């Protein structure tokens, strides 16, 4: 029987890792100056109290844990959180989050269509052509300026219809690193309550664009205009438990009751797929957010990665304007995020990860993390010279 | 949109606690939990995986992204506590789940991908999560005679009878050993049987294997599986580290897809990591690492051997002892079954009428199909249920 399998189509970035003077720019995890990825204080301090204090390991939570349920609310709604309209379902990392919250979706709409940018996280469209959903592209990154097309996204979001679901990057756009300004957000705001369709914010970023707080104006904005909508988060990346596998889904309803259906839905939804969610990664977390003494250090430790990514992406831009004479570059400074879309055709992507040993995405996707005052200046000469 | 949803059903066993603890009656009596209790109504964490967890915290120094499939010590070190020397590494497809249960969802993706018209065939009675799971999933759902009513031992004639209407490409799903909820288990005679009308009809077997180590002992609980994973070619078996590590809430699990030749398993292997990535992308670290470090590590791997056995021994003679109890009080070996089941529950084969009376007369409370956890017993209460039983006329 199993031999009538069909080989499936291996994720691309995880090959690339595979595939590995080498300077890698693949895989979207935070890398310090010695290309280490590394647990954070906080984050070791949780697991050592956890070791301490926890008695048992029998069945918990199915949606998860309260505590996790709240201080995941908190930090990304802040004090736009109404407890009695939200649903909370903790997942397997942000990915577990997004499949459930399309499956979600479709028990209340079995004709939803999603709308993703153009161009967004592979994965994305993935999980939906796995499921048969329709997917649609709204126009997002200007591949001139480097920058947003606005006029285009807002253009073909109108064409939305009630029911669809639009699936938008809360910040830390992957993969390109454009962004959407706080006015850009109220927008789109426009168009959704116009249009009447749902949508879905993919938070995996939260805290390495411009801060924790800011990171999230724009999901709180959306979440204050449109009375229902979808929220993905996921710690593997502002917490640094890839591994862990936690995350969750946060469904903001219009009232208690529809809120009461939801919170139902999800929790089946775990059920019928793995059971109860993986305890240990949302136990750090929670601990972390809900001890004072933690979440200073964390935060903290958050910050001065955030600053440091900052500075590597002026000193890139600084490099290559004093190689080319011309601020064409200068867009890398402004980009916000782990990731930033160079523009360097297939022809040259493949060129130059051959003959100069850096590896970066196909679509030119590199990790700035990944780069350090040593491999600034070879990245600089390296597209200068392959300049086409 | 979200309007739209349908009103989803609670897991039910809330409200089953939530009639117990409105119970203003001090002797009550809960046998109808699901976990292993201790003596003092607890449920531990066992020495080596506390041992493990702190050896991971001194040498773990990155929580990056790990193995789409699973890290290769865990797969091999489940790979051979479930099939031991019989492991053929060369057709052996191994997927890291959440969960037992992420590796039954995950195994009928599979066989689905692999056979649209696929149609499972499941005990009665058996696990109710297993049934669930496939209604959703919308795979056709058949039934085998399995639980004999009257003896309380397996009706095993009447398992073969229906076993022989599927067809090739059908689905049959066995548990390998501690059948929850009723507690008999078939003989290794049989399972020889039972491998000859697979071979037979061409049925794919699904063998979800979640107490190993409860029943008669670790190897002796696999027995059953490695016959039919040495007679049958294709095998997908389920295995959960949940209550044999006492790991529940970490939601460790094991897919294993044996295959009849190395192209076919890279198939399979293929399609694995594929579900595994369309699913959550990666799976839980941390419990799969308890787990590969107790195996490898000669010193902890002693130790948990050590206490599971005494947990099945401390078992086993609760066992003995409610049976000898329900022998001195009938005058009868009508109740010996309770000394023959394996695992840690047991159905009694009394009616939804007679488990209520139990309950209001007597304050004891177990699953309305009357299956009760051996581990919730001991010296005070055995006496009790003992009685109970027999007043109700079960
Ligand atoms: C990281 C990431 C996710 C979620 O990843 P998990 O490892 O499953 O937490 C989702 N979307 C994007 C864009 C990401 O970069
Ligand atoms: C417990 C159990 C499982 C798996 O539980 P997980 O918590 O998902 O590991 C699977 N099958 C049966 C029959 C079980 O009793
Ligand atoms: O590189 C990225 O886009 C972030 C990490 C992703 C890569 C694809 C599998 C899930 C994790």
Known sequence: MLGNLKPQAPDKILALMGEFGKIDLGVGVY?????????????????????????????????????????????????????????????????????????????????????????????????????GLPVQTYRYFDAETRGVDFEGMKADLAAAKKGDMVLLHGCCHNPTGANLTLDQWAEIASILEKTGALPLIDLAYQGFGDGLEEDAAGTRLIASRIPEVLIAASCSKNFGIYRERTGCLLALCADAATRELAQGAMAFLNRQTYSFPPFHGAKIVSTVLTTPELRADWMAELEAVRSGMLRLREQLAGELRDLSGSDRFGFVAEHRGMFSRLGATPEQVKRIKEEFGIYMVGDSRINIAGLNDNTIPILARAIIEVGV
């Open 31 to 131: 890398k310090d100056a010695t290309g280490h990825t590394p647990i954070m204080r906080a984050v070791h301090a949780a697991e050592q109290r956890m070791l301490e204090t926890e008695t048992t390991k029998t069945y918990a939570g199915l949606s998860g844990e309260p505590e996790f349920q709240k201080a995941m609310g908190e930090l990304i709604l802040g004090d736009g959180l109404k407890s009695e309209t939200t649903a909370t379902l903790a997942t397997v990392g942000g990915t577990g989050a997004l499949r459930q919250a399309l499956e979600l979706a479709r028990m209340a709409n079995p004709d939803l269509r999603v709308f993703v940018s153009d161009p967004t996280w592979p994965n994305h469209v993935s999980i939906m052509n796995f499921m």
